[PDB]
Amino acid sequence: AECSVDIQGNDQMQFNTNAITVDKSCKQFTVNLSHPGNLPKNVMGHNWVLSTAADMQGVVTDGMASGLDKDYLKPDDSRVIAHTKLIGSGEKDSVTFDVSKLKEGEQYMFFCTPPGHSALMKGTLTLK
Ligand SMILES: [Cu+2]
């Protein structure tokens, strides 16, 4: 409903949006991630990861280094505000997070951390 969004990552390393708006009065927000296509998780897995704009580089750098078995996220990374798990084609995962984690006027970015994906699979998240 108003406090959720559906996003897709496909076999061509595309998310289907580059901008998410969250109603600032939502108590929680949910992202429902899915993966059209047929490529398996070990080839074309995707996740959905939220951080500040400033933290994204570091999250991506350490995430890509962390490997498939760690969903390409640094374990215990305090910069990651919220994340789904890593999913392959035909799979689905949802994450819910507390909108009080987020500041009106702050610049947030969502992105996919797997090797080769983050520059191609990113966007803004902003409160309205
Ligand atoms: Cu991806």
From Swiss-Prot:
CDD domains xrefs: Azurin
Domain Plastocyanin-like: start-end pairs: 1-128
Matches recorded under InterPro entries: Azurin (IPR014068), BlueCu_1 (IPR000923), BlueCu_1_BS (IPR028871), Cu-binding_ET (IPR050845), Cupredoxin (IPR008972)
Main location: periplasm
Compartments, as annotated in UniProt: Periplasm
GO molecular function annotation: copper ion binding; electron transfer activity; identical protein binding; transition metal ion binding; zinc ion binding
A Pfam cross-reference name: Copper-bind
GO cellular component: periplasmic space; plasma membrane
Alphabetical UniProt keywords: Copper, Disulfide bond, Electron transport, Metal-binding, Periplasm, Signal, Transport
Binding site for Cu cation: 46, 112, 117, 121
Disulfide bonds: 3-26
Main function: Transfers electrons from cytochrome c551 to cytochrome oxidase.
The protein's name: Azurin
Origin species: Pseudomonas aeruginosa (strain ATCC 15692 / DSM 22644 / CIP 104116 / JCM 14847 / LMG 12228 / 1C / PRS 101 / PAO1)
